[PDB]
Curated annotation (Swiss-Prot):
Zinc fingers (C2H2-type) by residue: 3-27
Domain notes: The 9aaTAD motif is a transactivation domain present in a large number of yeast and animal transcription factors.
Induction: By insulin.
Name of this chain's protein: Transcription factor Sp1
Organism annotation: Homo sapiens (Human)
Source organism superkingdom: Eukaryota
Lineage of origin: Eukaryota, Metazoa, Chordata, Craniata, Vertebrata
UniProt record similarity statement: Belongs to the Sp1 C2H2-type zinc-finger protein family.
Subcellular location: Nucleus; Cytoplasm
Modified residues (Phosphoserine): S17
Modified residues (Phosphothreonine): T15, T28
Effect on the protein upon substituting T15A: Abolishes PRKCzeta-mediated but not PKCdelta-mediated phosphorylation. No effect on DNA binding
Tissue specificity field: Up-regulated in adenocarcinomas of the stomach (at protein level). Isoform 3 is ubiquitously expressed at low levels.
Effect listed in the UniProt record for changing S17A: Abolishes PRKCzeta-mediated but not PKCdelta-mediated phosphorylation. No effect on DNA binding
Amino acid sequence: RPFLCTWXGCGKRFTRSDELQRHKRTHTGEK
Ligand SMILES: [Zn+2]
């Protein structure tokens, strides 16, 4: 399952959901 970040134009795709969760932390708040 392509765990793709759907924030704005930040279409970064991940292989593991933890990677996407980790990544999403960047958008969730200031840094
Ligand atoms: Zn993103």
